[PDB]
Amino acid sequence: SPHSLRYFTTAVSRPGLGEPRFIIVGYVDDTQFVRFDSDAENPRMEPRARWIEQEGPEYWERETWKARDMGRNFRVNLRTLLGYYNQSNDESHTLQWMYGCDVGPDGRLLRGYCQEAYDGQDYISLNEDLRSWTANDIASQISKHKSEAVDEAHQQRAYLQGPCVEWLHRYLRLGNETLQRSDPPKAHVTHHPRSEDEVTLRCWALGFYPADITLTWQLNGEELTQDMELVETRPAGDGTFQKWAAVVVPLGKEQYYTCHVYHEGLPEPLTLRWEPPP
Amino acid sequence: CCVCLDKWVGHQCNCYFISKEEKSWKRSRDFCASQNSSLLQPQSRNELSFMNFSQTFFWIGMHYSEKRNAWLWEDGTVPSKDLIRPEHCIVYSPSKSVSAESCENKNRYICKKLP
Amino acid sequence: HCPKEWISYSHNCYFIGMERKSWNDSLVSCISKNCSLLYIDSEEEQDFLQSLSLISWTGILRKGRGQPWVWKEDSIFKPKIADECNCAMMSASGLTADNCTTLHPYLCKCKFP
């Protein structure tokens, strides 16, 4: 239902190890599709999704060009920021920029973003109205004043409401079979003897797409009473995800515990139990 | 008068060609030479005052003299502000930023018509 | 032959207004200098205007919510325009609708004889 186009840009300064490292990563609906790294063999905008390869050299040229200007400007911005904060050049400093589109099932803009952080702390951000900025300190107030003088908020709002929305639609159709696909989770239950009278029952959910999932354990057909151990959803590295939920059950009580897998890629939810060999 | 040829931009009785195309430093100065112009030498603070809002970087007529061991303009002149590697060539942003880069890297450029 | 402080492109003079004005005041200010508020003829001109990388009120306007964008003199160029936001402005991302009452800079096209 909700759709998004986002760019995560990072410029991380080098302590004498040459120029700062410059990275741009493009995400369509929380999945990476393009990348720019100044540390790669020949810096250019590279495809990170098979469906974006459908773009001609005209697209890649335009984006490689935008990225090379961005890096130069982020380098200059790092040198300005060092002077503002009276910091030594001999240390690792980082400038981050996140901007993008949020559209609903209705192909219109819900919210636009344009925010920056210096050394992990918010610096300057565009308001929901997309007409004014929020500074955080003296340095960012100077940068707000500089942005105002070049009508940056209006420029960013123009991109956020226009090209960002329009391009997101192009990407959504370009990789529909992938973006809106449903990889059902492959679930199983492992048995781990934890104590002399206790056991860990781990319910795995593997190879699922999208990342949204609900894993829950039920004792005799009723929700958890004890503390349930659960890992933060992790990528398998192939496009699919992994997650597991575990419970410390008494020995001989394995059958009185049932696992429930809740994922959109499943017509009916999965009911799992530990299967002991005869 | 002070008019310019088709696709050129006139300002302060100077004719400028702002490239759409990306070219190497050598090929860019070779394109400027043919149009009886040269790469821009922005020794003046706000040479591209009309371009002041632009964040885009363009090749400029700057060369490192390995004999004098310092940066020099195509003119032979010595600059003074905004600057490092001798093997690199210089790009300039109308917003007054300066950046060094590989001379074999492709970039946009600005030709300034000679009298 | 344009004044020294101004821009000369394809036999037309261009200057930025000293202040950020409303759509009406921006149209009024250009007329007062024997020029017109920015109008787009070709993509080559639009791309050159996008090179300047400025926010500028454009001549293109609409009378209301359902009324169409108005521009004349048989120039086919009608770019994509992205409420009370009934006036079109030019940016680095192309033409964008905005509230006429909001103050933005403006560029005048003069075209001396």
Binding site: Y7, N73, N77, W97, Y123, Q155 | - | -
Partner: peptide, 9 residues
């Protein structure tokens, strides 16, 4: 596609 501009701090 990416934004044509960034913030000049």
């Amino acid at each position: 596609a990416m934004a044509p501009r960034t913030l000049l701090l």
